Amino acid sequence: MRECISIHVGQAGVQIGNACWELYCLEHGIQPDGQMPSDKTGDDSFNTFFSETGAGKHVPRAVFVDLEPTVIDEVRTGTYRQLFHPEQLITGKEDAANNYARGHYTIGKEIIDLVLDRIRKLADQCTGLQGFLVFHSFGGGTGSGFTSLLMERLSVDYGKKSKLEFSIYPAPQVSTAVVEPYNSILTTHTTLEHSDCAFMVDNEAIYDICRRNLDIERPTYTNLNRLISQIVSSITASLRFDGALNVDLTEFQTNLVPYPRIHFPLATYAPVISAEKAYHEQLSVAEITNACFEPANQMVKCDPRHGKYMACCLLYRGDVVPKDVNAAIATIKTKRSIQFVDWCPTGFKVGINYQPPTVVPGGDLAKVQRAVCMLSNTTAIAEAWARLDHKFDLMYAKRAFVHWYVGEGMEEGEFSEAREDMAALEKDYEEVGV
Ligand SMILES: Nc1nc2c(ncn2[C@@H]2O[C@H](COP(=O)(O)OP(=O)(O)OP(=O)(O)O)[C@@H](O)[C@H]2O)c(=O)[nH]1
Numbered sequence: 001m002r003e004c005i006s007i008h009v010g011q012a013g014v015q016i017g018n019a020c021w022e023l024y025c026l027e028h029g030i031q032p033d034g035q036m037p038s039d040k041t042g043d044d045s046f047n048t049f050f051s052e053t054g055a056g057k058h059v060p061r062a063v064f065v066d067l068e069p070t071v072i073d074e075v076r077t078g079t080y081r082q083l084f085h086p087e088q089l090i091t092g093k094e095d096a097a098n099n100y101a102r103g104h105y106t107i108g109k110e111i112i113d114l115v116l117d118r119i120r121k122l123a124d125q126c127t128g129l130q131g132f133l134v135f136h137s138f139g140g141g142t143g144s145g146f147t148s149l150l151m152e153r154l155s156v157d158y159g160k161k162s163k164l165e166f167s168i169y170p171a172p173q174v175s176t177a178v179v180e181p182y183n184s185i186l187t188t189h190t191t192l193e194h195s196d197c198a199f200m201v202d203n204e205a206i207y208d209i210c211r212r213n214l215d216i217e218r219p220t221y222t223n224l225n226r227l228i229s230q231i232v233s234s235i236t237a238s239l240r241f242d243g244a245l246n247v248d249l250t251e252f253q254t255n256l257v258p259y260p261r262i263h264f265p266l267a268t269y270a271p272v273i274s275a276e277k278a279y280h281e282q283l284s285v286a287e288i289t290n291a292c293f294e295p296a297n298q299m300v301k302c303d304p305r306h307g308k309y310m311a312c313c314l315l316y317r318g319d320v321v322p323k324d325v326n327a328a329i330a331t332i333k334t335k336r337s338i339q340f341v342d343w344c345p346t347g348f349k350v351g352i353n354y355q356p357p358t359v360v361p362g363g364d365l366a367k368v369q370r371a372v373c374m375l376s377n378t379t380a381i382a383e384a385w386a387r388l389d390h391k392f393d394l395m396y397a398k399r400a401f402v403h404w405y406v407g408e409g410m411e412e413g414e415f416s417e418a419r420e421d422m423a424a425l426e427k428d429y430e431e432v433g434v
């Protein structure tokens with residue numbers, strides 16, 4: 001059984017959600033109408049993410065929420081209009097206008113009950129609900145504010161359930177708001193005690209990979225989201241194919257998060273090959289494993305040689321021989337600039353999914369024989385928190401834009417409480433890093 005419910009909040013959450021469910025369907029052989037031919041055993045491993053109707057229709061265990069309707073209307077009328085039921089696609093009338101306070105307080109309060117009601121309808125269809133996967137931006141008023149309100153409400157209504165995040169970290173090369181450093185700090189503060197594990201996706205890292213490895217001069221959100229979905233699928237594959245590592249949401253915390261507040265693992269993916277380049281000699285297990293320690297392949301911009309490891313998981317997919325993985329890991333424990341923290345076990349956890357990696361037809365990514373996603377909890381990711389905090393500090397010293405938040409419910413003191421919590425988080429990393 002062991003079901004997982006995916007929640008996509010705001011434009012970034014919804015659009016990445018579109019790319020993910022398209023890829024999940026292709027991986028599991030589900031058509032855009034929800035029908036599936038072959039399968040054969042209920043006993044289908046993908047039933048953790050897809051419910052099955054009496055007609056044999058495979059329905060994603062997903063909720064899509066936005067405070068304005070334009071993005072979700074495209075889902076309602078697009079290629080996957082028959083995949084999701086209309087009740088799973090929830091929209092408001094007025095967005096949060098890049099304001100956390102509107103998303104969380106004034107506008108978010110109007111749709112929270114309806115969203116929770118729809119989540120409850122999906123939870124009732126579960127016989128062993130594991131928990132939730134939450135997709136959202138840090139920068140958006142909805143992505144930041146509404147997500148933190150929903151995370152707070154889910155911790156009360158489903159106390160025993162695990163909650164994982166896929167968070168879109170802001171970048172000037174891909175940006176929408178001047179106020180995004182405020183929204184980022186505000187959502188991090190209010191979500192920190194309600195999230196078990198969060199995968200940050202730095203828009204600059206994704207932008208750099210698309211330009212450097214996919215030879216895309218100016219990447220659109222489509223280009224960025226197809227790369228993000230490929231990495232998200234690599235992380236959730238274990239939950240959809242019944243492997244040996246990260247088989248349940250609880251295991252993500254057990255394997256990657258020894259210190260509860262320090263729950264931000266760095267994802268590194270390989271190989272990223274352009275579809276529009278005539279392939280070459282296929283990359284070996286050792287080559288794709290070595291690429292996991294190449295900073296250029298990270299989902300977050302940071303220097304892991306400056307940091308220390310708390311945990312490390314390697315998730316292989318495709319034509320991967322276990323002895324070849326063991327030899328690749330043995331080399332990493334030798335040629336070691338891999339320093340683990342004081343009281344952590346020092347081992348690498350390994351998972352192998354033998355299905356050939358799947359890519360979107362008409363996508364930018366080339367089909368490969370073998371791929372790997374490394375999930376490492378490193379103190380080097382604190383560099384990303386420091387960048388946000390510095391931007392927050394510059395504006396907050398002058399109280400620039402704070403009037404917008406104060407006029408939308410929010411107390412000025414919340415800005416100081418949030419920033420102090422970020423200062424304590426930076427100190428947590430610093431204490432572990434020595
Ligand atoms: N990777 C990625 N980032 C996106 C996408 N759409 C928007 N963003 C980023 O998300 C941030 C803006 O947040 P949004 O998700 O667009 O907005 P929202 O959450 O709907 O909130 P409001 O519209 O302000 O109510 C910026 O950092 C954008 O770069 C997308 O499809 N992919």
Ligand SMILES: [Mg+2]
Binds near residue numbers: 010011066068071
């Ligand atoms: Mg929007």
